[PDB]
Design an enzyme around this catalytic site. Structure first.
Site, PDB file in Angstrom:
ATOM      1  N   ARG A  75       0.949  -1.080   0.321  1.00 47.30           N
ATOM      2  CA  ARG A  75       0.046   0.075  -0.084  1.00 47.30           C
ATOM      3  C   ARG A  75       1.323   1.064  -0.188  1.00 47.30           C
ATOM      4  NH1 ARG A  75      -2.526   2.812   5.034  1.00 47.30           N
ATOM      5  NH2 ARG A  75      -4.272   5.061   3.722  1.00 47.30           N
ATOM      6  N   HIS A 119      -2.562  10.440   0.796  1.00 48.87           N
ATOM      7  CA  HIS A 119      -2.250   9.950   1.575  1.00 48.87           C
ATOM      8  C   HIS A 119      -1.504  12.003   2.136  1.00 48.87           C
ATOM      9  CE1 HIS A 119      -1.474   7.319   4.704  1.00 48.87           C
ATOM     10  NE2 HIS A 119      -0.270   8.219   4.810  1.00 48.87           N
ATOM     11  N   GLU A 164      -7.778   8.580   5.622  1.00 51.67           N
ATOM     12  CA  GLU A 164      -8.572   9.334   6.859  1.00 51.67           C
ATOM     13  C   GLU A 164      -8.661  11.371   6.946  1.00 51.67           C
ATOM     14  OE1 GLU A 164      -4.840   8.925   9.702  1.00 51.67           O
ATOM     15  OE2 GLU A 164      -5.218   6.882  10.025  1.00 51.67           O
ATOM     16  N   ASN A 291      -7.421   1.798  10.077  1.00 50.28           N
ATOM     17  CA  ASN A 291      -7.052   2.182  10.375  1.00 50.28           C
ATOM     18  C   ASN A 291      -6.507   1.809  12.030  1.00 50.28           C
ATOM     19  OD1 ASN A 291      -5.487   2.711   8.167  1.00 50.28           O
ATOM     20  ND2 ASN A 291      -4.656   4.472   8.139  1.00 50.28           N
ATOM     21  N   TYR A 293      -4.459   2.426  16.049  1.00 47.32           N
ATOM     22  CA  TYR A 293      -2.728   2.067  16.446  1.00 47.32           C
ATOM     23  C   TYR A 293      -3.436   2.302  18.785  1.00 47.32           C
ATOM     24  CZ  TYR A 293      -0.792   3.414  12.512  1.00 47.32           C
ATOM     25  OH  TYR A 293      -0.359   3.357  11.417  1.00 47.32           O
ATOM     26  N   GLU A 348      -3.708   0.074   8.335  1.00 45.74           N
ATOM     27  CA  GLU A 348      -1.967   0.434   8.767  1.00 45.74           C
ATOM     28  C   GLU A 348      -2.632  -0.172  10.078  1.00 45.74           C
ATOM     29  OE1 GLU A 348      -1.565   4.515   9.802  1.00 45.74           O
ATOM     30  OE2 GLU A 348      -1.819   4.898   7.074  1.00 45.74           O
TER      31      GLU A 348
HETATM   32  O1  LIG Z   1       0.848   7.864  12.807  1.00 45.82           O
HETATM   33  C1  LIG Z   1       1.706   6.980  12.239  1.00 45.82           C
HETATM   34  C2  LIG Z   1       0.603   7.042  11.061  1.00 45.82           C
HETATM   35  N1  LIG Z   1      -0.302   6.914  11.124  1.00 45.82           N
HETATM   36  C3  LIG Z   1      -1.260   7.050  10.244  1.00 45.82           C
HETATM   37  N2  LIG Z   1      -2.771   7.559  10.240  1.00 45.82           N
HETATM   38  O2  LIG Z   1      -3.202   6.630  11.621  1.00 45.82           O
HETATM   39  C4  LIG Z   1      -1.213   7.784   9.252  1.00 45.82           C
HETATM   40  O3  LIG Z   1      -1.886   7.445   7.949  1.00 45.82           O
HETATM   41  C5  LIG Z   1       0.296   7.298   8.876  1.00 45.82           C
HETATM   42  O4  LIG Z   1       0.647   8.230   7.425  1.00 45.82           O
HETATM   43  C6  LIG Z   1       1.264   7.554   9.989  1.00 45.82           C
HETATM   44  O5  LIG Z   1       2.672   8.128   9.305  1.00 45.82           O
END
Ligand SMILES: OC[C@H]1N/C(=N\O)[C@H](O)[C@@H](O)[C@@H]1O
Ligand SMILES: [Ca+2]
Ligand SMILES: [Ca+2]
Length: 443
Positions: A75, A119, A164, A291, A293, A348
């Site tokens: 990606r 992006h 996003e 995505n 995290y 992600e």
């Molecule tokens: O913060 C980590 C990563 N997280 C991201 N979104 O949650 C971004 O798409 C990506 O460009 C970024 O580097």
């Protein structure tokens, strides 16, 4: 053992401004990240994307690392101002050439490209005309998208309109922490709305131009949990999910209006007759990218959008982000419960840790392995419970420019020494190669 479905897609992800460098090479126009990062005070250490990982020159060697790791999906994003330096009008053949070489090489090697059309590196020329604040961006983005579809759609069959849109709108135009660095809540909600309009126009032209393809859209998500059983804290969690997560965009796409608590909060900031555009915004999509995290404990706070976060004594990454692997399961279950999209990808997932090269010349990042393992296991649980999860992409292939944090935050499974541009596969890279080989987790 946790085996994934046979057709499961294991990938790695990057974005153009974060890795390429050479932002003004070969006739490219400036982007808003070039101008934002070149403004003193906006980025840690005054870092910029001027050089980054030098992927603009090193792309072939980086693709050879993807092959070496045995990864079968990549990606990546395309820089709009490399293709249309002024955003609309003039197409820059050398920008097309750069991505054609990447696309052809990926196909030769049997790596499936997933292309993110946007992006965050908007052409500066378009920001001078209001950028995402301007209704006409639906036209500009449809033009740009058509260029990509006509040029690359013979080879690339999996596309993402926007990475996003919440971050683009709110972080870029309300918090002012990302380009174009604005703080106006009316502009920010017009950006939300124009992002949906632009996305829908791109999907509409995709149906004309790539009849054998699939197109989707990517959302940031966090796992919000309430600080107490008080109704106000429960409601604050509901608000954060509807505003910060996929519903802000999927309620429009699937149901033709913004989510209830978003309307309650923001109707005054939206365009007066925003609902006129909802019929177009419902354009059918093929998949949803999520995505994920981190998680957050949330409380009602009248001094705060009336929500504050409560720090927990949980393990954290180098970003300060709490490690809450069950949130990836929660978000997958919830997207199915709420909108039942036909296909979902984790587009992600990843972690920044303080990586060092030891005397053995290796990068021993067990903490990153533990992070990825826990989240992959939770994704697997979601699949067992019926979520149509089709793939998972690690953020990132490479350590890279972490936006306003600059180069200080390393998310790669491959370390980059920025003095020499040497790549060193991290232990997490070798680990993930083994995950792909086993089609899942083996212990
Ligand atoms: O913060 C980590 C990563 N997280 C991201 N979104 O949650 C971004 O798409 C990506 O460009 C970024 O580097
Ligand atoms: Ca090779
Ligand atoms: Ca209408």
């Amino acid at each position: 053992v946790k085996k994934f479905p046979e057709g499961f897609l294991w990938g790695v992800a990057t974005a153009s401004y974060q890795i390429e460098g050479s932002p003004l090479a070969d006739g490219a126009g400036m982007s808003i990240w070039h101008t934002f990062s070149h403004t003193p005070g906006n980025v840690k250490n005054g870092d910029t994307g001027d050089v980054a990982c030098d992927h603009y020159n090193r792309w072939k060697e980086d693709i050879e690392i993807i092959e070496k790791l045995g990864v079968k999906a990549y990606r990546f994003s395309i820089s709009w101002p490399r293709i249309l330096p002024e955003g609309t009008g003039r197409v820059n053949q050398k920008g097309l050439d750069f991505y054609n070489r990447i696309i052809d090489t990926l196909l030769e090697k049997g790596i499936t490209p997933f292309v993110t059309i946007y992006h965050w590196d908007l052409p500066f020329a378009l920001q001078l005309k209001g950028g995402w604040a301007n209704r006409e961006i639906a036209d500009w983005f449809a033009e740009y998208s058509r260029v990509l579809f006509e040029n690359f759609g013979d080879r690339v069959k999996n596309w993402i309109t926007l990475n996003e849109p919440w971050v683009v709108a709110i972080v870029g135009h309300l918090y002012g922490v990302h380009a174009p660095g604005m703080r106006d809540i009316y502009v920010a909600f017009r950006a939300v709305h124009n992002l949906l309009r632009a996305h829908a126009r791109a999907v509409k032209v995709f149906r004309e131009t790539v009849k054998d393809g699939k197109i989707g859209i990517v959302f940031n998500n966090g796992y919000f949990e309430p600080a107490s059983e008080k109704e106000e804290d429960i409601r604050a969690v509901r608000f954060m999910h509807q505003f910060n997560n996929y519903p802000l965009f999927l309620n429009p796409i699937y149901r033709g209006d913004y989510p209830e608590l978003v309307l309650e909060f923001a109707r005054e900031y939206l365009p007066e007759n925003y609902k006129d555009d909802m019929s177009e915004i419902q354009e059918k999509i093929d998949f949803v990218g999520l995505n994920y995290y981190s998680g957050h404990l949330v409380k009602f706070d009248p001094d705060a959008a009336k929500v504050s976060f409560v720090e927990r004594d949980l393990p954290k990454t180098a970003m300060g982000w709490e490690i809450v692997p069950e949130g990836i399961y929660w978000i997958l279950k919830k997207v199915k419960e709420e909108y039942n999209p036909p296909e979902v990808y984790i587009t992600e997932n990843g972690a920044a840790f303080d990586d060092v090269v030891s005397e053995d010349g290796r990068v021993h990042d067990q903490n990153r392995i533990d992070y990825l393992k826990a989240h992959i296991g939770q994704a697997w649980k979601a699949i067992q419970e019926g979520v149509p999860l089709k793939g998972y992409f690690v953020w990132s292939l490479l350590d890279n420019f972490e936006w306003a944090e600059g180069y200080s935050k390393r998310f790669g499974i491959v370390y980059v020494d920025y003095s020499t541009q040497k790549r060193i596969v991290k232990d997490s890279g070798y680990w993930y190669s083994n995950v792909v080989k086993n089609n899942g987790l083996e212990d």
